[PDB]
Design a protein around this ligand. Sequence first.
Ligand SMILES: c1cncc(-c2nc3ccc4ncc(N5CCSCC5)nc4c3o2)c1
Ligand SMILES: c1cncc(-c2nc3ccc4ncc(N5CCSCC5)nc4c3o2)c1
Lengths: 351, 351
Amino acid sequence: KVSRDKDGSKVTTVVATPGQGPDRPQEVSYTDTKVIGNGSFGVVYQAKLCDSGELVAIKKVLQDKRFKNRELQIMRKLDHCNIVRLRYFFYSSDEVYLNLVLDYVPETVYRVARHYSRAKQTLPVIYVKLYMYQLFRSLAYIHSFGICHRDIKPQNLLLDPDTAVLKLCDFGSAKQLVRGEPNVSYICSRYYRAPELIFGATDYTSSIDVWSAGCVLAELLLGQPIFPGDSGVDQLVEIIKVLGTPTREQIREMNPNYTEFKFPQIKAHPWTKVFRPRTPPEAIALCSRLLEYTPTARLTPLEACAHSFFDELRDPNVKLPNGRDTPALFNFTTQELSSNPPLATILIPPH
Amino acid sequence: KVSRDKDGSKVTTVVATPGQGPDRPQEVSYTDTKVIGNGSFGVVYQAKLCDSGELVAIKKVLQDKRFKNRELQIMRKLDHCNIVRLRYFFYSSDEVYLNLVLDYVPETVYRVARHYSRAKQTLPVIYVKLYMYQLFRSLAYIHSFGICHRDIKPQNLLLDPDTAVLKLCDFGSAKQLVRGEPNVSYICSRYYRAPELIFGATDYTSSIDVWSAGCVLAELLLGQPIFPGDSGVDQLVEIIKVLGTPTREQIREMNPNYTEFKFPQIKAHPWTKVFRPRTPPEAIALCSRLLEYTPTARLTPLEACAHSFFDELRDPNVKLPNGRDTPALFNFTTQELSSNPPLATILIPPH
Ligand SMILES: c1cncc(-c2nc3ccc4ncc(N5CCSCC5)nc4c3o2)c1
Ligand SMILES: c1cncc(-c2nc3ccc4ncc(N5CCSCC5)nc4c3o2)c1
C-alpha cells in the first residue's frame, strides 16, 4: 500500500507485528524514506511514522522462507533502556525480506569520538563514564539471557547527544551461547575481536563482549583504536605489543584445541604508559581488568558497572555537562542483578 | 600422512594436484607449519616444502561437496608474473577443506606504507610507481579473461622487498563477469569500494577494480586512505567530500535502478589540495583519471600502465633504490595487450 497524502508526500503502509507485546499484526504507515546504512544483510532506512511523527530505523534483511531469523528471535526477547527497541517487524519484496522497525537515535559513540580525534583531542572522561557504564548495563542484561552480541564496537553504540542515553544496536552477529554447541571463530569487527576468536576458539563465552568493551574504553581514552590490526592474525600481534606474549596456560584458557602461530616472545608494556599522562588511573585500572587474555579473568558487565571509574556517576550531585539530569542509571531490575544480586549495595547509591 | 624425519621434525605428506600442468595428483611433503592469516573462509598457513626447501602459503577453505569452488577454477587459469602462483591444491579434514598451495611472498604494500605513515613520512614515489604499475599489469591480465578481483586493497598486494616484485593475492571475491547475470553489490573492502556498488549496482564491470587501484594510489601518496567511511553509505559521503556530489548523468551511469540516499549538495574539492604540496602532478593526474564516478570514464589497466606517471620506469637507466635491476615490466604477452594492442609502442621501450 503506497499512496500520496494532502501535499504530495509518498506514504508507505505495511502490516507489521508489534515488536514486544501481543502477536497482533496492525497497519503501520511511514514516509520520508532514505538509506542510512547497508551490509551483507541488506539496507537500513530512516523513515517517519505518520501517526506519531517519530523517526524509526528500518533494517531490511533477505529472509530464507524455511530458515528462522536468529536476530528477530533475540530482538523480540529484549526490553531495556540501553538497547534500541524493536517497535515492529514486517515482510516485503521472488525472495522475501524481514524488516525490523527500530527507534531512531541520531548519533553513535564512533562519530562523537571521531569529531574529537579528527581535532587531536579526547572526549572528556564524564562522557566516557556515561557511555561505558550504559554499555556494561546492556551487556549484563543480554548476558543474563545467555545472549552474546559478538560485535561490540563504537558504531553499534547509538546515543542521544542531549540526554547522553546510549542504545546498543545491530544484533545481526548476536547468538544465545549454549554449553557444548560450537560457535564460529571469525566474528566481531577485527579491532574489538577477543584473542580467543583469533586463536580459532569455537567454545568461547559472553566474555568476548567484555574484551570488546575494553577495546572501546581504551579507544575513547586514547582517541584511536588500541589494537589496529591490518588482518585477523596481525590483530594478535597488535594485542601482544601491549599485553605481551600470552603464557601456554593463557593460550589453553583461550582455545584448548589451537594450532601453531609461533610468534616471537615480547614483554608486556606497563598499562599506565599506554595512555596519555593525565588519563585517570581508575580508567587505566578498569582497562587492565577488561583486557585480560584468560577470558574468565575479565570482569563481568555487572562487576564493570561497580568499578571505581564509575564512582562519579553515583555522586548525588552529578549532572550532564549541558546542565540536564543524568539519564536512568540505577533503576536495575531483578534480571539485571541476577549474575550477582549483592552488587546492588554498590550499584544503587543511598538516595 | 603425518611422520617424523631424520632429526625428529613434523612432516605432513598430502596428495595434491599441480596448480598448472596436467591433472596428475602427486605426493607433496611440507613442515614448519604456522598460521599467518584467517577470515570467514578459514585459515592461511606458512609451510616449507621438504624436497625444495621453498616457502608456501596454504589457504584452507571449507568446501561444500555439492558446490564447485569459484576461487580454485579462477586460480587454475592464471599464469602471470604479478599474480601469486597456485602451485598445488589438495583436500583435508565430517567436513572437507580445499587447500590452495601458493608461492610465499614475505611483505605486503600495506605493511610497507604503514612503516612510512607510522613515522609520518611518505613512501618515495619510485616505490609507488613500481607497485601501481605491476598492479595495473595483473589487472590488465585478469580483465582480459573477463575476471574481476573485486577486493583490490593494499593488503592483497604481496611484494618481495628485495626485487620489488608485486603479486596480487586473495581471489576469494574474484568472479568472471557475464553481461546480464547479476553480481552482489556488497563486495570489496569498504575504503576501496566503487561508488556504483554503494548505489547497490548488480550489473557493474571490471572497472570497479580500477576505482580500487585509484584508492590504493591515493593512499600511497597521502599516507592514509583517501575515503575512510565508518560504514557502507558513509563511504559515499567521504567520496563526495572530495569528488563533490555526482551529476544525475553520473548516478545513472553507476546504477540506472537506484533508490533515495537524499544527501546534501557538496561542491568538488580541488584535486591538488587533497595531496601534500610536493605530490608529483602526473601522480595526481593519474588519480583523477582512475577515481571517476562514471565507470566507463575510468582508464583501463593497460591505459593506466601507459600513463606518464610510469614514464620513469621505461627509462633505460632506471634501477631499484637498493641498486639491483628493475624486475620484468615490459615482457607483455598478446593476451595482456588484447584490450588495446597499439599501446605496445609506449608500453615496450626499444631497450
Ligand atoms: C547495520 C546493521 N545492523 C543494524 C543497524 C542499525 N540498527 C539501528 C537502529 C537505530 C538506528 N538509528 C539511527 C541510525 N543511524 C543514524 C545515526 S548515525 C548511524 C545511522 N542507525 C540505526 C541503526 O542501524 C545497522
Ligand atoms: C587471505 C585470503 N585469501 C588469500 C590470502 C593469501 N594468499 C597468500 C599468498 C601468499 C602469501 N604470502 C605471504 C603472506 N603473508 C606473509 C607476508 S605479510 C602477509 C601474510 N600471505 C600470503 C597470502 O595470503 C589471504
